[PDB]
Amino acid sequence: SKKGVGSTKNGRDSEAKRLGAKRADGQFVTGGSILYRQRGTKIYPGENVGRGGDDTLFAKIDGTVKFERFGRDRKKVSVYPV
Amino acid sequence: FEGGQMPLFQRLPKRGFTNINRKEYAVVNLDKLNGFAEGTEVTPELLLETGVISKLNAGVKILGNGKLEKKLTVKANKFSASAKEAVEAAGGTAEVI
Amino acid sequence: PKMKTHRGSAKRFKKTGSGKLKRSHAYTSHLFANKSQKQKRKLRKSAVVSAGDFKRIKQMLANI
RNA sequence: CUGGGGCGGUCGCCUCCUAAAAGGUAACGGAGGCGCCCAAAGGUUCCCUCAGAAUGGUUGGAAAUCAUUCGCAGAGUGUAAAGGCACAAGGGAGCUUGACUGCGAGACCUACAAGUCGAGCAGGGACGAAAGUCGGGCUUAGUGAUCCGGUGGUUCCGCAUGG
RNA sequence: UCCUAAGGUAGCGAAAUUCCUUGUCGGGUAAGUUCCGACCCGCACGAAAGGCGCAACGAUCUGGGCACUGUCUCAACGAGAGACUCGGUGAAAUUAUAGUACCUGUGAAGAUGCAGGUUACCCGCGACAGGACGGAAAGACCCCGUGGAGCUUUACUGCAGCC
RNA sequence: UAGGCCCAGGCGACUGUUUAGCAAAAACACAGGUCUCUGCGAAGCCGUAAGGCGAAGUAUAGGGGCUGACGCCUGCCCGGU
RNA sequence: AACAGUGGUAGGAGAGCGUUCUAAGGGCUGUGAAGCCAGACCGGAAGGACUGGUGGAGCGCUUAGAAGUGAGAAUGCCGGUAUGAGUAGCGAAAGAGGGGUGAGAAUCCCCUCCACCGAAUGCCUAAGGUUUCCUGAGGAAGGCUCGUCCGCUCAGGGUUAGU
RNA sequence: UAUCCUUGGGAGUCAGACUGCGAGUGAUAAGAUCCGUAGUCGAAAGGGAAACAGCCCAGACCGCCAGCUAAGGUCCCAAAGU
RNA sequence: GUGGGUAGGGGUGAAAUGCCAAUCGAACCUGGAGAUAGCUGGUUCUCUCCGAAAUAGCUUUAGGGCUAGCCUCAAGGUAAG
RNA sequence: ACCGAUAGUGAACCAGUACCGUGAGGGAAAGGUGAAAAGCACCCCGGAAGGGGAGUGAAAGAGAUCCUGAAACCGUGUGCCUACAAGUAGUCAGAGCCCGUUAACGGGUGAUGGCGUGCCUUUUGUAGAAUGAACCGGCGAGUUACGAUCUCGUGCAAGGUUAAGCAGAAGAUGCGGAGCCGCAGCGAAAGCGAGUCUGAAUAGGGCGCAUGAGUACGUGGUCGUAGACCCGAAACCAGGUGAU
RNA sequence: CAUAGGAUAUGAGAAGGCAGACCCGGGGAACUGAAACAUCUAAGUACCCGGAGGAAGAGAAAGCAAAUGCGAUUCCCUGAG
């Protein structure tokens, strides 16, 4: 014999959209490719990067990529040409 | 076949429609006429037995890739626009059958 | 006897020149109030069958 | 599907934790959503703080409304959650409909099909003096293949030719 | 007092029904979870799925008593038919090779075979069957196959037939 | 070499029959009860017609269902099917 | 020549061995082939010869081509044989003795008694059996044993209707 | 140090195990189960752990009656210091 | 006892799903038929060459399958790893 | 470039028989003396059966299920070993004794020592107490037919190549250009074409070509349709034979 | 009246079987394939029944086809998968 237990009620999960860094620091990055995916603007676009409508990061120009800071506790993507 | 998953030939739409009245025009790159000399006859009966066209599929259109240097008596069914001027560029006649 | 052509896969794939396969895009038959404008310009073009599934059904339509 | 099946519970999506400071990873492992809603709750233009507390006070009381300080935040973010946000994304007013058609070099993701991201280009716009923004809504959910017949427009074919 | 189309009457009742249970109360016995007699908090008896009571009946079925008994304490002996023995004839299931000890310990978790020890001259014969997961039957139970065949009805589409 | 008997108890009334070759009864059958179909080319059946079963029969007859001799009995509900 | 590597299942890749048959050349065989039987030979391997003994008519090499292409496992098919092992069984039942036959007899033929059934283990006769009935020879097998015997094997012979 | 990518022919595999660290499920029970990253085994013989897939060493072209070390050992089985 | 009758998706049944030639929850025999079997057993001659995986996604799938992951063979661009 | 008696017709032979079944049906087994029956007179043993001689024949071991005659298995003899040893039965050390072959670091036994648990299938895992086989011998499983595709290879190459048929021993070849593939695509299409659709756009992108090689055939590697790798279901359906 | 019928006579008049092969009409499935099953496939085949011929059956246009037109059918190869 066995006492039948049920009542799961929690057995679901979403599938994660793949966030995190995409193009590395100092990488030669062409125009219009993505750098970083984020829910909520954690890393602001800085020089030569715009904020997407789905608030990701996309490079306006070609060249290399750096990450400086916005001073207190805030980050930034800086992209420079050659 | 994919084991029960919907196979690829169905989850794609149908964008096919075939008419009866199609015409495979004979394809000449205009450069096989450089095998001939200038001033010769250009008829679709001649292009068959010279090995130029292996099959007259009811229509001989002349394309325009390449160039000519030979004045030719060209008569054929249809002509592309650059081919009509390229035969005249060699001075050849451009009769339309 | 000689091979058939897998007929449903012949009415949906114009064989391109230089050894590739064209197809249409899916999700484009009937339901349109819930997909935005931006997908609709992306899904009236054509595309190519990818390198994975090309290995499966290249036998079905090797008769043009 | 199943810690033997039975019944019971669940089946796809979205968010968090497990997850091992990149991404992903399962369990009938822990917590809650969704099958929308909005004609302004969008577009720009310009405008400006919030939550409580403390007082002072008719009815007024613990708690309506008025000031009044102290308040970078405890609130508010059409809605779950995480991530942000007091230079607005929070809050008002005006004018308007870009909730634009044709696109899109380039990438992220991915077995496939799908799904994402966008500079810029054109035609026409809206708002503003202009620069400039606007290809729906604070991002991520709000729904589904083809076959199928209905529906409006079609320099497309139409079986001898004309329809 | 709500609810029903209507709320079990007669006769039976811990029952071939009764779970808790071996219900309690009495006879049967020194002792009686079964059996009979009555009790009704009938889980779930009930009127032609029939209810109750019934003399005669049964290789039915439960319970009790006499008669007589190897059924038993507790075995004994005798006859014969196989058994063993001496000629006659002479199979079979099964069967990897096989000079096949038993203790622990380990291991696809329960040894004849390997490791550690322990004991054991070679070869038959009459008996016992603890073991070789001893043989006979590719498990009858159990779950899967997208197996299958009988059955079923308000599953689905059909058909015969009567309308 | 031809009965073992007595006390009660349910279940089946009874003699009968089946699980050839596990299961003889507490099951089936049974007389009787009983509601209903069916006016004679009956109904029901065999089965797409015939033909001649039912029946050289005719509601005191013949199919069908439900129970089980006899005795005492068979109450309530027409809403759903 | 130098340097390096060489365990391998599923799995891919490359080289070769060998049988049957054919194809051109060549040869080798009644002075003994194929096969078979033995060994201590050689080639890295599948392997290949070389004497010796059997056998009494065909068959190798070299290079090619075609394949029903090579066994050790299918609860495999089909024969041959072991295993158990001279081990189980020897199909209900009273004979023992004396003569006779004969190579041989517990059984066969005689006589003697004792045996057993006798509402049948006895006489007639359907169903069926088809030569078994009869006499005369025969013992290789057929009798669950021998066997001179018979329902067996041989050559003869045997059924008569008016009812 | 040489291994990557592209194109194309051909696959098999989609039941896995265990030891340590990082978690869940559990009872901070399993030689349990679900994974992370790392091993071995699977497909890997040899030596030790008495014997033992999964731990500790180490990879087997093949021959010798030679040499040195690792894990573990050195009274005697059972090679090496009482 | 004898002589006939009823045939398999049928017969027959005082009913068991029993009997229908030692067969029966649909007899028996050759036929379609070498049915189908995502299942189990079997798959023979040798060396050399390198050589894996048991996870992800989806699936009336969950012991099956296809695509991608990891291996070998060939051809390249080549030094990118 | 078919089989050679388990193959090939089930049947090389009294075979659709013998047998199994009332039945429709099922359905075997079994060829070889020599060149010539010349097939054993004659003598012994026993009742023979059966030999041993003799004689026949080149062979008689060739003599009656009659060529060759293996292995299982049953043996008869003898070389070496064994009745204090446990022993997947071997290996590798290893004396003694027995030996003299395809003449070479020999042959056969081995008292004793050390390491040592069969093969196969299926498994995360097997000596397995999981299956499989009594062994012995034979048969018995990835084949062709057609088309696809790729590599290797052949001949011609911006041209490759014929099907059916006629003639010709089935053939080889000759005739046969009807077609298909390729040399140009993109668009569903009309239509256009080195460009082409979408577009309003000489914009931009999609696929094209600019850096051309194919095709006829052949060995292979797979694949499609074919029993398609073998062995095996239970089951459905048709046509019939049977209430001894 | 006349017919049914009856009688009588002429009739190498028919019926029956085997190539288990072939074709032509009439009736007609099913496992399996679709990864399950019904339309569908399987295939109008398996088998059954009538016909005949040594061939059968179609056959001299109420046809193709769209050019400066062919000329009764059948079969092959292509078209073409």
From Swiss-Prot, chain A:
InterPro entries: Ribosomal_bL27, Ribosomal_bL27_CS. Coiled coil: none annotated. GO terms for biological process: translation. Gene3D superfamilies: 2.40.50.100. Disruption phenotype: No effect on sporulation at 37 degrees Celsius, however sporulation decreases at 47 degrees Celsius. One of its GO terms (cellular component) is cytosolic large ribosomal subunit. SUPFAM superfamilies: Ribosomal L27 protein-like. The N-terminus is cleaved by ribosomal processing cysteine protease Prp. It comes from the Bacteria. GO terms for molecular function: structural constituent of ribosome. Keywords: Ribonucleoprotein, Ribosomal protein. The keyword DNA-binding does not apply. Part of the 50S ribosomal subunit. Belongs to the bacterial ribosomal protein bL27 family. Plays a role in sporulation at high temperatures. This is Large ribosomal subunit protein bL27. It comes from Bacillus subtilis (strain 168).
Curated annotation (Swiss-Prot), chain B:
This is Large ribosomal subunit protein uL15. One of its GO terms (cellular component) is cytosolic large ribosomal subunit. One of its GO terms (biological process) is translation. Part of the 50S ribosomal subunit. GO terms for molecular function: rRNA binding; structural constituent of ribosome. Binds to the 23S rRNA. The chain holds residues 50 to 146 of 146 of the full protein. Keywords: Ribonucleoprotein, Ribosomal protein, RNA-binding, rRNA-binding. The gene is rplO. Belongs to the universal ribosomal protein uL15 family. It comes from Bacillus subtilis (strain 168).
UniProtKB/Swiss-Prot annotation, chain C:
It comes from the Bacteria. Residues 1-47 are annotated as: Disordered. GO terms for biological process: translation. Residues 1-25 have a biased composition (Basic residues). GO terms for cellular component: cytosolic large ribosomal subunit. One of its GO terms (molecular function) is structural constituent of ribosome. Keywords: Ribonucleoprotein, Ribosomal protein. The keyword Ribosomal protein applies. Belongs to the bacterial ribosomal protein bL35 family. Part of the 50S ribosomal subunit. HAMAP family: Ribosomal_bL35. This is Large ribosomal subunit protein bL35. The gene is rpmI.
